Design goal:
The structure is a homotetramer. With about 350 residues, chain A is an all-beta fold. Chain A has a single domain, classed as 6 Propeller (Neuraminidase). Chain A is about 0% helix and about 40% strand. Chain A has no helices and 29 strands. In chain A, strands 1, 2, 3, 4 and 29 form a five-stranded antiparallel beta sheet that branches. Chain A has a four-stranded antiparallel beta sheet with strand order 5-6-7-8, with no helix packed on it. In chain A, a hairpin with a 5-residue loop joins β25 and β26. The first copy, chain A, is globular. Chains in contact: A-B, A-D, B-C, C-D.
Chain lengths: ~350, ~350, ~350, ~350
């Protein structure tokens, strides 16, 4: 493993609809985005079937729910520009056609929802800097001009809200270390300078908030194990030391907070099966990795259902989408075995960063 | 203080719009509902001014945001039936006229949002039982028939979601004790039997969730001090003992979780000023009560702004609405002094339960 | 229940020998101190049998282990002066005769071990002030002169070390409130002024340290329920609000930290049986009281064995000493039923404070 | 760094006397054990001066306080047998001459105090197995015969009590992994089988208990960073995954629990200065390493004074003993700079394990 490697990513993007039904977005062999959704917001629900958005795309799709409940998808087009399309009403399967946001992007798009209800998109630009564009009014198809935040990115960006509403963005830099930059006031265009968090990383960063309000960042390290760092104060400049966990992982990690408020991390393990680790107590030590039966061909994508149950999506060896879930809304629940969401095969359309 | 007393309630109901701007609803001297809203989602924002909904009402209004971002208000009419009106689009100040939901109600209405996106309303009925009615599809003006959950209520009901999506409802019973009843599966019409939590209470119950997922209930006790009880397991049947805190309070309490994940409680104190107490550590002991200058004439109503800052609304001695807020997004922030939201005077339209 | 009442106390004092065998001290119908000890440091051990110290006493005996492992007992004599006697070697049943420390005392004695190895005794004096006397060298029969700390005491004193080695003393004052006073530097004769913790109490105070280093104080309140308060900072002046727990208790409480670091409290309940409550999580909420079968005639005295198992001693209706213990070294262990430590009957020799 | 390396150890062993004065034991250029002690139990106390025990030794000395307060030192002699000598009374500077315990030992000795007051010594034997010998009565010069616990050791052993009084012993095995073995009942000669904790380690293991009762083990790993693992249940068989902390260390670590109950770790860092890291919250994340000025030539040895203040001892470049300490009994206290405990120079007499 080399310092500039980027671990295998998830094969779909997932979102909860306004009524919390899960909906997945991926790219098929026709290079178009397809999507599928639960018919009811429970993991054992039937799925509607795969439906196509017309248009050829050249990145992994990113999806986020607007503050009025409508899903909106962002993707790079054949012109290397940003395109988006949206549900025309919450919980409806009527969509716009792809609409242009222009620009020139060289990474997958990352979408955040500001705490004033406005979507904001972060991408690597043609000059390898971080660029962003935002809705100028909440849940409205009115966007700003493109603006640069500088820097030099060698991974996809990952964005998350701090507890006080300030967006913070994480990305690997030219030295293969994790860097970050943040709004200095909530949902405004006033930003810090770039700062290094020092450690080399070999995956995109994955960010989650704990109960205490503080951000935690997970990534694969140079020795191919999971490592993590967390905010220790009230601001974006006070961080812990990095810690690693034993166990070689072969994909990006995926993190989720269970309904007991504890963190869980999923990743493809050294034997190409799905591995899971969880915090055993508040802030506590981490469990040994547990493995699920079955070889997988992507990183996991993890979501929560309306009753709190965790559900995991992966690419199978047959190049189709599989999933499994918790049988009960309990931290020690047993899990189902992999089930197929059949109808199309999927490709990894992630932008090749080099 | 007698066992059947119900402490003074808050004078307004508050909600966050889809873009997180606060909006308050109260009843004026014309017995109509009026509302006012922030023009931007920050506590130092200007307010738009008081606007009237036509129609005479006979209860405190209850407000909740739909899963598509539209606010919806519920109130008892002059016919003792339930009426509602809604924003016709998220973050817009265009409303329906009051529309009928019928029934016969003898308490203030309480509204909950199920985790599948459907609003559900709980009221005491003409037979003193708990009744409820729900949207049959998420964020849609299609409602069920009225259905009884039984029991005998001597307070307004308070409802909250468990971490697994099950609604749980709390209300004082015929013996002046706190009782509760819960969905046995998330967002379904399958309910438990009524169970007593034993302690006498002299206010409506106030329910909040902690980070661990568990519900905590606050109420005034028979000796006029604050008392509280919390779930200790994974279900609705395992509760702690009751604990009281020293200090006589003269209103219902209001509880909020700050951005550090700790709980804070506000109440009118024995000297008729606003009092505040907070948890000093995770699950920790509670601080001595702190007082704010100024005599108040209602219980506090507490809300959070888009940047996490807590804001408190009270009725002043001039019968107008006043508010104060935290100066910074920090747990140890200083507070502003009371400021007026002028333009109308307010009355307490709470249903007299005896 | 009146504000000046002092709840029933424990009938024996207990200590661990240098090898951790438990040894109990009580007063029999001959007004002499008798003692009995485990033959091995396990709760199911046989006991040696009751042995008498010659001499008539007029208070409950207090016992503490010296820093060289020798037990030492303190008691008021027929002359109202303080007397003491000691093991002449650790884990040996050879004792000195009662030896005089003079003074004039009007409460039971309370003994503390300073963190520099010197015993220090606290008593109410003939002028109702707090007085103390100390070893001038660790584990040596060389004592200081008597010195007054002032104040007005209406309970027995309770002393405990802070985490930094400063002794802090708690006692009810003339206004029936809990007061305290503390060393301002570890194991030195430099003391603070008296300060009130405000709440009325109707038992002696009981003090324990939690894992965080902080002191917690338990007492019965004016409504005959358990109440407690805890340090919230790094010093002796920052305390939480008082909290009460529901449930009427009819004796002083006894507190212990179990081997999981959680606190447990035992007391005689409203039905004259032994009641137990425990913290369900770190700093967490408290369980409902659980009852053990059997009417008891004293407060419990609680100790821990060499394997961590909790053991409880009480006076039975037959005026003899009974005990029960945990069956395993686990927080959720079951308990044995009461067993007799037969051979003498015991009287409550506690000094009548009025 | 190779898998079989054993990091540099501390240059002295330290103990608290019965009155909590610190006393240090090391080996000088004459191959004899010398010791020095505080004259009062405070870090700014003067020290008595270096005093010699007659006799040539061939290991680092181990010291433990007996349950009657007397210090006792264990060391390998020129005959490769175990020898010991003891204070003849607590807090006295009168010692026995070295007395024989025989055996054949190939590591430094490790001493534990059972919870029934009996010392027990663990050593690697001439067959590379773990051997032990124990006092047959508490604080008495009567010892058992030597007994083997089997295994194959490639480090010195480290022993610690579990919260329930069971001794647990940790040592590196033939595969360079950390192994452990434990008493299955407190202070009895009934032991488990050896079990692997799997990770390679390149230092002796260092064991400490947290507040929750659970053991935590620290060691240097194969990549020369600090790693740690902790018990997650009520027994000796349930452990967390291993975690590493960033930062190359060049000595064994030393761990201590501060008076707030949080853990701190000291080690020589990659630049040969003393480094310190601490837990920022309960169980929490670990701080970045902080450095103290001054090149050091051993691992640190860490102790606590009677007022809770941490004190650290190291070998200086002048081959003399230096120390520094906290200025106040507070977790965020500043520290003094290195001060000399002059009078002799010290050598590292640690047994060469290969």
């Amino acid at each position: 493993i080399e310092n500039s490697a980027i671990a295998l990513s998830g094969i779909v993007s997932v979102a909860n609809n306004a009524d919390n039904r899960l909906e997945v977005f991926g790219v098929s062999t026709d290079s178009a985005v397809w999507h599928n959704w639960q018919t009811a917001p429970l993991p054992n629900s039937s799925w509607a079937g795969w439906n196509k958005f017309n248009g050829v795309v050249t990145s992994k799709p990113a999806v986020h729910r607007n503050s009025d409940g409508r899903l909106e998808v962002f993707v790079r087009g054949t012109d290397n520009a940003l395109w988006h399309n949206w549900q025309t009403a919450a919980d409806t399967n009527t969509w716009s056609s792809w609409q242009p946001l222009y620009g020139g992007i060289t990474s997958n798009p990352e979408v955040c929802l500001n705490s004033d209800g406005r979507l904001e998109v972060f991408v690597r630009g043609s000059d390898n800097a971080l660029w962003h564009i935002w809705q100028t009014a909440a849940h409205t198809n009115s966007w700003s001009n493109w603006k640069s935040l500088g820097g030099t990115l060698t991974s996809n960006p990952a964005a998350h809200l701090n507890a006080d509403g300030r967006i913070e963005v994480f990305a690997r830099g030219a030295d293969n270390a994790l860097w970050h930059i943040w709004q200095t006031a909530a949902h405004t265009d006033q930003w810090s300078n770039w700062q290094s968090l020092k450690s080399v990383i070999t995956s995109d960063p994955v960010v989650i908030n704990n109960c205490d309000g503080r951000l935690e960042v997970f990534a694969r390290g140079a020795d191919s194990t999971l490592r993590h760092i967390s905010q220790i104060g009230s601001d974006s400049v006070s961080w812990s030391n990095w810690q690693c966990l034993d166990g070689v992982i072969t994909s990006a990690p995926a993190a989720v907070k269970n309904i007991s408020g504890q963190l869980e991390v999923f990743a493809r393990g050294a034997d190409n099966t799905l591995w899971r680790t969880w915090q055993t107590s508040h802030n506590g030590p981490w469990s040994n990795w547990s493995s699920f039966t079955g070889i997988i061909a992507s990183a996991p994508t993890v979501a929560k259902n309306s009753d709190g149950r965790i559900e995991v999506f992966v690419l199978g060896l047959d190049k189709a989408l599989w999933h499994l879930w918790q049988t009960t809304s309990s931290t020690t629940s047993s899990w189902t075995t992999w089930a197929l969401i059949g109808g199309i095969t999927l490709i990894d359309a992630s932008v090749i960063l080099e």
